[PDB]
Amino acid sequence: NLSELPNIGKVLEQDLIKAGIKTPVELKDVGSKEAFLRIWENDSSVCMSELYALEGAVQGIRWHGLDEAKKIELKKFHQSLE
């Protein structure tokens, strides 16, 4: 049911699961960044898209609609990564 929670694609829930994050409530209290990092530990290829997708799912909206402040914040942490 990770397939509900908007923004999440078939391959995103693929690695979310790999990272040990099934169920929406497992990802709600670790939040996007953490989830992001975990899956990144697996494929270095994850990226900004997935970051937004994850925090989109935690707020209950499609990410293009995340509020700005919050998107800089995610950009800063993504770009701070590598």
| Site of interaction with a copy of itself (CB under 8 A) | 9-11, 45, 47-50, 62, 64, 75, 78-79
If the CB atoms of residues 23 and 43 are measured against a copy of itself, the closer one turns out to be 43
If the CB atoms of residues 25 and 41 are measured against a copy of itself, the closer one turns out to be 41
If the CB atoms of residues 22 and 62 are measured against a copy of itself, the closer one turns out to be 62
Q: How far is the CB of 10 from a copy of itself (least distance, A)?
A: 4
Rounded CA separation 72/2 (Å): 26
Rounded CA separation 82/62 (Å): 25
Q: Are the beta carbons of 37 and 14 closer than 8 angstroms?
A: no
Q: How far is the CB of 65 from a copy of itself (least distance, A)?
A: 9
Name the strand (E) or helix (H) holding 36. helix 31-42
Positive or negative torsion for Cα 72, 74, 77, 81: negative
Q: How far is the CB of 14 from a copy of itself (least distance, A)?
A: 8
